[PDB]
Amino acid sequence: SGFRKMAFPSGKVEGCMVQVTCGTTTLNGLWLDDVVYCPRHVICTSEDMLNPNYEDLLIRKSNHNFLVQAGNVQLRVIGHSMQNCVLKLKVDTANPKTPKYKFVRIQPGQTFSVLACYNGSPSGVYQCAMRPNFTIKGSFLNGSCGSVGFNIDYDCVSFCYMHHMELPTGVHAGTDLEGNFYGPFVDRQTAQAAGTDTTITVNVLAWLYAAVINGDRWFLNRFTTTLNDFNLVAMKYNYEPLTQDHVDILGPLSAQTGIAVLDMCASLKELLQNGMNGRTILGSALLEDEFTPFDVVRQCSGVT
Amino acid sequence: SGFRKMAFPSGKVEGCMVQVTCGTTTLNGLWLDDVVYCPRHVICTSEDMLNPNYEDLLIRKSNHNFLVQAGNVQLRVIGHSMQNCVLKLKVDTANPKTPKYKFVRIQPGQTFSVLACYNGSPSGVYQCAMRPNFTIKGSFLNGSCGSVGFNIDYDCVSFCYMHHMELPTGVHAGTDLEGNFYGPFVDRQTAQAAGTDTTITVNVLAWLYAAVINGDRWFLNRFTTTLNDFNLVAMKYNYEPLTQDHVDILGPLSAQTGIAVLDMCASLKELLQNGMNGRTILGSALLEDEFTPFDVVRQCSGVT
Ligand SMILES: O=C(Cc1cccc(Cl)c1)Nc1cccc2[nH]ncc12
Ligand SMILES: O=C(Cc1cccc(Cl)c1)Nc1cccc2[nH]ncc12
């Protein structure tokens, strides 16, 4: 028992990290097979970042201008192309450490692990959620661009995020591995509105089920609610409206604990209306929304 | 910017994990050079666990009774010995993935990463603290015994913990890599008192400095305090007494922010006496003590 904000083991991703330098800029790249993926802003100088003309900046670059280093060994670049906001550097050697992998575009409210890197070297790993507004609240310093987010299903790494930018608000924005930003963001040094965010209701409910499984039960009450009534409360408290699709994904946790989803909704309703009263749930004094129902089941069943 | 409960990249440790089976019991082992380390209770049956006679149980075992499997390949066991609460299984092949490593006994209040494993396969990685009472609040299910805790300083893995037991209270106990338990625990299925725990004051202060560095400043006040006055408050709130040694380790963070350690102590004093008033610090609604001053500097400087 016990419940932690657990990340996937990062080894399979550590073996893919490289350093990419173009001119004066260094960031991280992801080496899979014979391609290195990295943020296209590796080609910018500070003078360029207010609104870079990426097409023109890339025309001034040749294969030999992209310095790619995998630990201590240099990779030979034999092609380059820009796809949306990523560059794809074709190299003459397939990464021997390439794991089985997929590129996936995750949905808002889903979670993933981030391997924060600097100069192609891994620094640390943490778990986070893609907010409903498509930002991430990460831990990224200058030089972390090109670090990736991923999930692992047995031996397959599904890469879902590449880090590109820290907005002036201190929240993070990035792309899928085809270089499409999550959210409305653009790769320019400008203030950019991130939408209104909401709390991921189905994840808070999953975490309340994790709490019951792991011994924290004080918040269970004698009440029930309906989706309509619960959604009036979710509206007031800026929580995502709950749907039958969310109730269905909570089915396994409802079956494991014997607590009907709408009864757990009534516990969440009381917690939203009354607060925690100075108590904690799974070591937290707030309602946690960074665990999906799949994460809770995986953590409570010991999936490897 | 941003601050997360970050674990070390686990790849170097993933390469050391093996499955050890003895009779009907399977758990995890750590393969370094030509030795596999695992909890000695791998030799017990359920009938043995109330108070096992480990010496007698191990006398009934031969090298060929210890089944060690590294992924899909079987290791040949050419020796066995019990050291405190660990078994050391000498194998005929040095682990090719053995990283540079050390065995260290950590101090209470220090932090480390855990690579939770089942059947020798990594499941996930998380960061935690060794409580002042020598327990850990982990995420461990049955089959996780033998999972290890570690820190990494550049290319060297310092292994500090091997998981052995979940106490009836749901908290975790284990040993250093020489098999000495942290705390008063014994490897038997009995209720065992864990001491009175306290909050790790120097880590809460480090985390308040991380909060100021990362933009959360609302808790800064016009006050100062002394070590004596602060320690009266720490006493009331079950916090570890602060010493000049703790003030000295907070020196770098004090220099980075320009906030004297005793002024930060006055902010912590007000937070202990008044609570958070429904506000958060670094996404937490409680005072976090699982980040050391070294962790805060490492995370805020991008060490790889
Ligand atoms: O965000 C950027 C580069 C950049 C600026 C504008 C647009 C783009 Cl696409 C890229 N550098 C950072 C500086 C400081 C902390 C940081 N955390 N994560 C990144 C990061
Ligand atoms: O703790 C043990 C085995 C054991 C019992 C008594 C003494 C010893 Cl040394 C070992 N099994 C577990 C069962 C369920 C969840 C668990 N989490 N971590 C372990 C764990």
Q: Which helix (H) or strand (E) holds B161?
A: strand B156-166
Integer-rounded Cα Rg, in Å, for chain B is 21
Question: Cα dihedral sign for A220, A224, A229, A231?
Answer: positive
Is residue A99 within 8 Å of A15, Cβ to Cβ? yes
Residue positions counted in chain A:
304
Residue type at position B93: T
Report whether CATH 2.40.10.10 matches the domain B15-99. yes
B128 is catalytic: no
Which residues of A does the annotation mark as catalytic?
A: 41, 145
Backbone φ and ψ for B179, nearest 5 degrees, come out as: 80, 15
Q: Could you identify the residue written with the tokens 């686990």? A: B10
Residues of A in contact with B11 (CB under 8 A): 9-12, 14-15, 122
Resolution in A: 1.2
User: Which residues have a Cβ under 8 Å from the Cβ of B62 and sit 6 or more positions away?
Assistant: none
* Closest residue on chain A to B3 (Cα): A139
Is residue B16 within 8 Å of B32, Cβ to Cβ? yes
Give the C-alpha separation, B203 to B210, whole Å: 10
Cα atoms in the Cβ-side hemisphere of radius 13 Å centred on B238: 9
Q: Which two tokens stand for residue B130?
A: 């060794």
CA A76 to chain centroid: 31
* Closest residue on chain B to A290 (Cα): B283
Give the C-alpha separation, B203 to B256, whole Å: 16
Cα–Cα distances (Å) from A211 to A216, A283, B118, in that order, read 5, 10, 22
Residue type at position B152: I
Cα–Cα distances (Å) from A235 to A201, A228, A229, in that order, read 11, 10, 10
Give the C-alpha separation, B304 to B134, whole Å: 28
Backbone φ and ψ for B71, nearest 5 degrees, come out as: 70, -115
Q: Under an 8 A CB cutoff, do B6 and A299 touch?
A: no
Give the C-alpha separation, A253 to A205, whole Å: 9
Give the C-alpha separation, A69 to B47, whole Å: 56
Q: Could you identify the residue written with the tokens 């976090």? A: B288
Rounded to 10 degrees, what is the CA torsion of A211, B274, B239, B213?
Answer: 80
Q: What is the CATH number of domain A1-14+100-197?
A: 2.40.10.10
Write out the residue limits of the CATH 2.40.10.10 domain(s) in chain B. 1-14+100-197, 15-99
Q: How many CB pairs under 8 A join A and B?
A: 147
For ligand 2, residues with CB inside 6 Å are A 1; B 41, 49, 140-142, 144-145, 164-166, 187-189
Residue type at position A261: V
Write out the residue limits of the CATH 1.10.1840.10 domain(s) in chain A. 198-301
Report whether CATH 1.10.760.10 matches the domain B198-301. no
Q: Under an 8 A CB cutoff, do B2 and A140 touch?
A: yes
Helix ranges (H only) for A5-50 are 11-14
Q: Which two tokens stand for residue A277?
A: 């009263």
DSSP calls for A180-228: PBSSS--SSSS--------B-HHHHHHHHHHHHHTT--TT--S----HH
Give the C-alpha separation, B70 to B101, whole Å: 19
Nearest by CB to residue B126, choosing from A5, A137, A301, is: A5
